[PDB]
Amino acid sequence: DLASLAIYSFWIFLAGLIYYLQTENMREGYPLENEDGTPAANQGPFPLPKPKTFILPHGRGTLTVPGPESEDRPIALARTAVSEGFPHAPTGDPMKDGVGPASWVARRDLPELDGHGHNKIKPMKAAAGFHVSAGKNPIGLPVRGCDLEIAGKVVDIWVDIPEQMARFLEVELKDGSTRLLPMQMVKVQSNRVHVNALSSDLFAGIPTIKSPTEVTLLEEDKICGYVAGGLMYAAPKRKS
Amino acid sequence: AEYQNIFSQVQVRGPADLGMTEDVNLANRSGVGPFSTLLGWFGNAQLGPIYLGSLGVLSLFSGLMWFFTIGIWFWYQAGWNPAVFLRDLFFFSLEPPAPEYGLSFAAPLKEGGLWLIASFFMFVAVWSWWGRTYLRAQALGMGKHTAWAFLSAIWLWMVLGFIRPILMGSWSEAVPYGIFSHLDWTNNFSLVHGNLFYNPFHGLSIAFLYGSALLFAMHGATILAVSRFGGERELEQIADRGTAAERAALFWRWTMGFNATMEGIHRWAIWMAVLVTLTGGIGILLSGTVVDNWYVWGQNHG
Amino acid sequence: ALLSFERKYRVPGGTLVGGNLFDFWVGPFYVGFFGVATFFFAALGIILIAWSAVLQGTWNPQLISVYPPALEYGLGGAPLAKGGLWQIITICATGAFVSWALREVEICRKLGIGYHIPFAFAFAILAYLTLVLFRPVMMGAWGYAFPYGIWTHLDWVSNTGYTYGNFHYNPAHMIAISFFFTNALALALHGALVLSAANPEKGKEMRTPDHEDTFFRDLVGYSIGTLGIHRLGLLLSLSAVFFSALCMIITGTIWFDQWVDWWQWWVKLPWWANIPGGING
Numbered sequence: 131d132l133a134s135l136a137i138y139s140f141w142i143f144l145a146g147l148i149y150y151l152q153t154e155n156m157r158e159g160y161p162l163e164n165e166d167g168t169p170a171a172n173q174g175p176f177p178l179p180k181p182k183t184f185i186l187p188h189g190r191g192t193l194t195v196p197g198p199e200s201e202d203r204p205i206a207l208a209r210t211a212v213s214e215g216f217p218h219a220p221t222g223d224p225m226k227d228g229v230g231p232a233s234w235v236a237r238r239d240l241p242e243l244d245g246h247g248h249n250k251i252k253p254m255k256a257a258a259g260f261h262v263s264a265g266k267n268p269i270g271l272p273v274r275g276c277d278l279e280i281a282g283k284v285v286d287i288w289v290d291i292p293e294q295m296a297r298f299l300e301v302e303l304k305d306g307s308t309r310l311l312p313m314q315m316v317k318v319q320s321n322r323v324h325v326n327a328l329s330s331d332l333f334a335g336i337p338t339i340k341s342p343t344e345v346t347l348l349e350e351d352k353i354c355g356y357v358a359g360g361l362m363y364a365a366p367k368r369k370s
Numbered sequence: 371a372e373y374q375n376i377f378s379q380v381q382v383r384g385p386a387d388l389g390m391t392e393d394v395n396l397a398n399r400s401g402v403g404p405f406s407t408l409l410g411w412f413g414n415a416q417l418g419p420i421y422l423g424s425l426g427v428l429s430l431f432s433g434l435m436w437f438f439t440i441g442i443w444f445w446y447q448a449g450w451n452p453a454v455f456l457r458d459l460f461f462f463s464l465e466p467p468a469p470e471y472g473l474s475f476a477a478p479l480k481e482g483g484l485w486l487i488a489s490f491f492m493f494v495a496v497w498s499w500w501g502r503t504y505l506r507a508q509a510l511g512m513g514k515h516t517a518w519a520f521l522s523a524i525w526l527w528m529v530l531g532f533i534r535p536i537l538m539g540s541w542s543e544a545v546p547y548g549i550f551s552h553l554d555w556t557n558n559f560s561l562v563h564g565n566l567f568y569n570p571f572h573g574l575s576i577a578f579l580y581g582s583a584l585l586f587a588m589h590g591a592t593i594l595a596v597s598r599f600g601g602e603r604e605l606e607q608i609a610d611r612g613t614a615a616e617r618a619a620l621f622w623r624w625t626m627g628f629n630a631t632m633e634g635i636h637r638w639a640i641w642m643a644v645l646v647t648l649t650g651g652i653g654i655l656l657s658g659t660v661v662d663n664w665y666v667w668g669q670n671h672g
Numbered sequence: 673a674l675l676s677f678e679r680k681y682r683v684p685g686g687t688l689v690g691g692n693l694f695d696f697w698v699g700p701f702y703v704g705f706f707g708v709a710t711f712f713f714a715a716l717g718i719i720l721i722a723w724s725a726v727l728q729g730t731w732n733p734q735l736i737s738v739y740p741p742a743l744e745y746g747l748g749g750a751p752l753a754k755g756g757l758w759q760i761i762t763i764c765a766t767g768a769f770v771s772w773a774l775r776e777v778e779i780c781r782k783l784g785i786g787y788h789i790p791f792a793f794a795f796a797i798l799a800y801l802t803l804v805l806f807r808p809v810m811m812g813a814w815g816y817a818f819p820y821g822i823w824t825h826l827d828w829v830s831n832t833g834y835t836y837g838n839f840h841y842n843p844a845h846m847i848a849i850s851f852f853f854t855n856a857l858a859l860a861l862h863g864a865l866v867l868s869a870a871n872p873e874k875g876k877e878m879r880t881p882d883h884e885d886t887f888f889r890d891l892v893g894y895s896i897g898t899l900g901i902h903r904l905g906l907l908l909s910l911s912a913v914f915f916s917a918l919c920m921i922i923t924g925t926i927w928f929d930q931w932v933d934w935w936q937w938w939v940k941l942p943w944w945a946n947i948p949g950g951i952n953g
């Protein structure tokens with residue numbers, strides 16, 4: 131019977147498809163590892179797929195995956211137990227060390243580029259002629275932390291040019307320098323910008339950028355990680 | 371509370387974005403439309419530009435011809451009365467020829483011929499719109515994934531109105547043009563074929579339809595949960611994995627013991643979706659051609 | 673046992689209950705209090721289903737079925753063999769699902785991410801609870817819920833629907849189906865777009881999000897964008913489930929006749945009800 135053949139065939143196709151899908155999804159983070167960074171004995175029944183190569187635009191190179199995985203950074207953590215499967219305690223200050231919910235990946239220390247090869251993200255003052263088109267303009271507002279203390283003041287919005295959206299608020303601290311706060315981590319209110327993740331005294335600790343009119347993939351990760359990390363690590367000063 | 375990133379708090383605008391050029395014939399692009407502040411709380415504010423070109427115009431005109439052929443019939447059925455038209459809008463139906471005419475184009479206008487003309491215009495509207503999804507990708511140097519995915523939807527459509535009727539021996543097997551009547555056709559199709567719940571392809575089709583809602587709830591939710599680390603910048607996370615993509619992965623690894631990559635989730639996505647109409651088209655195509663009664667088939671599984 | 677980047681994330685903390693007591697993993701799986709709770713609820717339920725299979729006299733997966741109390745029981749208890757197991761298996765299910773969501777919350781907290789995933793899951797749970805808890809309670813009997821069996825759950829869908837004629841005519845059902853179809857449309861497109869950019873024509877460089885906006889603007893004259901599309905899929909699929917739960921919570925309670933007849937209110941509006949011609953005159 132033809133319908134029997136079709137259904138039997140479809141199930142074979144589907145098993146092959148799942149196989150293809152599962153192996154495609156192993157192009158990052160494999161091979162599996164023990165807690166010490168060495169190859170685990172049990173890799174499971176799916177083998178790594180043949181490598182593929184992405185040609186990156188603007189002479190940024192290629193990416194080939196799967197390939198040799200390494201963190202390319204020290205991880206300030208240590209075992210809390212004598213066997214596998216337990217948590218690893220921060221050895222220093224997890225906010226400063228960039229671990230746990232404060233983690234960052236070692237992405238390329240260059241800015242994301244748009245389709246024309248220009249910096250994707252720019253402060254608004256340097257983006258012609260971008261401006262606030264709706265909603266409360268946060269520029270000028272005091273920035274309050276989860277301790278209800280003023281940490282600083284908004285001096286600009288960093289915008290995504292090709293996608294015409296707000297990505298960071300640039301915030302000036304008591305000392306005259308600035309930090310970026312991810313847009314997703316702030317509440318813009320009528321009289322303030324409220325930051326639930328950080329108490330005021332942790333604002334100085336926000337990773338700084340090296341050029342004041344661009345931000346690198348690497349710097350983005352450190353900022354976003356640091357600010358997210360505050361949810362867990364600032365919790366003693368909140369109390370909300 | 372925490373801001374959830376469902377609606378934006380602050381919109382920004384800059385010069386109208388006219389987009390990438392690559393091999394696109396710029397002569398065929400409109401200029402920007404208006405900007406919608408409303409749309410921009412949720413997505414992009416900018417409307418247009420759109421691309422015209424010869425296939426575009428063909429498809430569009432042909433699509434309207436389809437729509438107006440049905441609309442003309444509707445007015446006729448309403449006796450040209452504006453108030454009856456609205457009252458009975460969902461009850462109007464443009465029906466295919468009766469079985470007697472088989473596959474011939476010899477049926478009178480008021481008894482099938484108009485359905486055929488409507489169907490003709492639909493055929494060229496859709497297929498030329500397909501050529502469009504291919505060509506707009508080509509002109510940009512992009513992969514052909516959209517046109518390949520569109521083809522799975524086209525398969526079910528083609529099966530319902532064209533392939534199945536041809537294999538069955540008559541246009542009377544096809545779907546009528548009307549709101550309520552397309553529903554009655556659907557119910558009747560199942561009844562007459564022994565209940566589609568016994569068609570293994572209908573069951574798969576459902577698994578994938580539900581699967582799509584599960585998966586898009588999962589993916590959408592995940593991206594929003596990691597948008598605080600720039601997670602929605604999926605292409606650069608593919609090219610250079612960030613903490614967004616690592617936290618996303620690990621969320622799922624810790625929850626259910628396996629995970630995706632930033633590129634691979636989108637392959638799970640496309641296949642979950644296209645499998646809906648793929649299995650669907652097969653289930654419908656076998657109905658009445660090979661299997662009269664799914665219940666009966668199910669009792670033998672063959 | 674660990675992805676190459678995983679260790680930096682496996683720190684202590686995030687739990688809702690029990691402090692460090694269950695703060696650990698088994699292979700890739702996080703545990704926590706709600707991992708333990710989920711295991712308990714799920715294991716009990718699976719055991720109770722197996723017992724029910726013994727009482728039914730079958731170990732065939734396509735035959736095992738666990739039916740709710742018959743309508744005569746109303747909203748009270750029933751003998752184990754005649755609906756009581758169903759009642760307990762349902763408590764276990766609910767316990768398992770809610771525990772699963774709450775374990776998801778603990779994972780979120782450890783990972784420093786938004787709570788969107790368990791929030792979305794809660795819609796699926798609420799739809800489940802609509803069928804087995806809210807609707808039966810509003811209708812006055814457990815027996816209105818669906819039975820737990822692969823094929824018998826499909827008999828119930830069919831029987832329930834036809835109780836109201838062609839269920840297509842439930843207007844809330846119509847909106848639900850619309851979201852389901854639109855969701856699958858959007859999943860296909862999102863999937864295809866991102867891949868068409870990451871995997872361009874042979875030898876070309878990866879395309880950009882700019883290319884993705886461009887493509888869709890070329891095609892239909894609008895592009896929702898990269899944040900928007902993930903917002904959209906979330907909304908479409910959660911709306912689909914919301915209107916699913918709506919379409920059923922109102923069936924057998926506020927409306928209980930043939931759904932086709934609900935549409936008569938529009939046709940019988942005074943200003944055109946009586947005009948001759950058309951389908952309804």
Ligand code: BCL
Nearest residue numbers: 572573574576577578580581584718800818822823825829
């Ligand atoms: C949602 C509206 C109706 C419904 C109407 C339909 C219809 C119609 C069909 C199904 C079908 C499915 N339904 Mg149902 N069914 C519903 C209630 C549910 C519930 C529940 C609420 O707990 C569950 C677990 C299931 C699960 C099942 C699967 C056996 C089958 C594939 C679905 C799927 O891929 O989903 C999408 C989700 C995924 C792809 C994720 C994968 C998870 C699946 C495979 C879970 C399997 C669970 C099952 C084996 C029971 C396991 C319990 C164990 C004791 C632990 N249904 C209610 C009553 N269902 C199809 C079928 O073919 O049935 C025979 C079908 O045609």
Ligand code: BCL
Nearest residue numbers: 523524527556557559560566572575576579650651653654
């Ligand atoms: C009483 C009714 C019967 C029944 C009869 C049918 C019939 C008949 C069919 C289905 C099919 C389906 N059924 Mg059923 N089904 C029932 C029970 C259910 C139940 C349930 C009980 O809970 C569920 C969840 C489903 C679910 C489904 C879907 C999985 C599937 C359709 C997928 C799809 O995306 O199509 C929607 C997608 C399309 C139709 C493709 C669209 C194609 C493009 C090319 C159209 C272009 C449009 C354009 C020209 C218009 C322009 C407008 C724009 C503004 C420009 N069925 C019962 C048993 N079912 C279909 C199937 O495949 O089954 C095997 C089908 O034919």
Ligand code: BCL
Nearest residue numbers: 796797799800829830832833838839840848849916917920
């Ligand atoms: C002959 C039958 C009738 C009909 C009967 C009715 C009836 C009756 C119902 C529907 C419902 C549905 N119908 Mg109908 N409907 C039919 C015609 C169709 C057609 C069609 C194309 O003809 C379509 C597309 C639909 C589609 C719709 C959907 C809107 C909706 C089901 C999805 C849902 O509620 O998910 C919601 C999701 C869930 C309930 C799943 C939640 C499960 C989670 C919480 C847990 C599972 C975990 C666990 C068990 C997994 C195991 C662990 C493993 C490791 C995996 N119907 C015909 C006309 N329809 C149903 C509905 O709206 O329900 C609310 C419903 O009850």
Ligand SMILES: CC[C@H]1c2cc3[nH]c4c(c3C)C(=O)[C@H](C(=O)OC)c4c3nc(cc4[nH]c(cc(n2)[C@@H]1C)c(C(C)=O)c4C)[C@@H](C)[C@@H]3CCC(=O)OC/C=C(\C)CCC[C@H](C)CCC[C@H](C)CCCC(C)C
Nearest residue numbers: 429430433434437495496499519520523644853856857860
């Ligand atoms: C495979 C799974 C799902 C799927 C996939 C899918 N659908 C697709 C695609 C793919 C990937 C395409 O890329 C294509 C697309 O372009 O999407 C935007 C499409 C598409 N699927 C569509 C609809 C659709 N898909 C369906 C669903 C599904 N498609 C499945 C669920 C359904 C359902 C569920 O019934 C609908 C109805 C369209 C939005 C689009 C195909 C466009 C098309 O073929 O157009 C032909 C006809 C016209 C060009 C015009 C028609 C005339 C209108 C009736 C009038 C409207 C007015 C007009 C637009 C204004 C112009 C006036 C001017 C003079 C000012």
Ligand SMILES: CC[C@H]1c2cc3[nH]c4c(c3C)C(=O)[C@H](C(=O)OC)c4c3nc(cc4[nH]c(cc(n2)[C@@H]1C)c(C(C)=O)c4C)[C@@H](C)[C@@H]3CCC(=O)OC/C=C(\C)CCC[C@H](C)CCC[C@H](C)CCCC(C)C
Nearest residue numbers: 580583584587714717765768772792793795796821822913
């Ligand atoms: C709201 C939008 C959609 C959605 C979203 C969604 N689902 C979710 C979540 C989200 C975001 C996940 O976070 C969560 C997940 O971990 O996904 C992998 C999940 C999930 N959705 C799942 C399934 C599922 N979702 C459904 C669909 C939907 N989920 C909606 C369409 C369906 C359908 C459509 O039928 C199914 C079957 C699981 C894969 C997972 C939740 C896993 C879980 O809760 O595990 C804990 C408990 C167990 C391991 C099993 C317990 C067993 C019971 C005690 C006994 C069994 C009783 C049962 C009632 C019998 C059913 C018999 C059937 C034949 C009917």
Ligand SMILES: COC(C)(C)C/C=C/C(C)=C/C=C/C(C)=C/C=C/C(C)=C/C=C\C=C(C)\C=C\C=C(/C)CC/C=C(\C)CCC=C(C)C
Nearest residue numbers: 440441442489490493527528530531532545547548549552
């Ligand atoms: C206000 O008034 C005006 C007139 C201005 C506008 C109003 C118009 C109105 C009200 C129109 C309403 C349109 C409606 C209600 C149509 C909806 C139809 C539906 C629900 C479609 C459902 C199914 C469609 C299918 C499956 C059709 C399949 C079609 C094909 C596969 C084409 C088949 C090809 C054939 C038969 C032609 C053969 C020709 C060759 C190539 C030999």
Ligand SMILES: COC1=C(OC)C(=O)C(C/C=C(\C)CCC=C(C)C)=C(C)C1=O
Nearest residue numbers: 858861862865884885895896897898901
């Ligand atoms: C990462 O890219 C994504 C967006 O951002 C560039 C989108 O713009 C779109 C397209 C959005 C629309 C118009 C939804 C189409 C479905 C309907 C409701 C007809 C897709 C698919 C997407 O993947």
Ligand SMILES: CCCCCCCCCCCC[N+](C)(C)[O-]
Nearest residue numbers: 401402403404417418892893894
């Ligand atoms: C499916 C979404 C439909 C998008 C609507 C099309 C918008 C295109 C706007 C073109 C008009 C340009 N203008 C203002 C010069 O006329």
Ligand SMILES: CCCCCCCCCCCC[N+](C)(C)[O-]
Nearest residue numbers: 569570571573574577581641642
């Ligand atoms: C893209 C992978 C998703 C695969 C989901 C598979 C679900 C299996 C559903 C069982 C259908 C049963 N049957 C016999 C009616 O076909």
Ligand SMILES: CCCCCCCCCCCC[N+](C)(C)[O-]
Nearest residue numbers: 174626627628673698699700701
């Ligand atoms: C459609 C039924 C799905 C049930 C299978 C669930 C898949 C979970 C696989 C993860 C296994 C992880 N590990 C390391 C223990 O192998």
Ligand SMILES: CCCCCCCCCCCC[N+](C)(C)[O-]
Nearest residue numbers: 148152173174175176627628629
């Ligand atoms: C239809 C959905 C089925 C998905 C389950 C198949 C993949 C789960 C097992 C993947 C193995 C994970 N592992 C061991 C490589 O880490």
Ligand SMILES: CCCCCCCCCCCC[N+](C)(C)[O-]
Nearest residue numbers: 721733734736737738820821822
């Ligand atoms: C309440 C439903 C009964 C539980 C069914 C047990 C799950 C086993 C997997 C079902 C697959 C059917 N199969 C292929 C073994 O026949």
Ligand SMILES: [Fe+3]
Nearest residue numbers: 589593604862
């Ligand atoms: Fe995505």
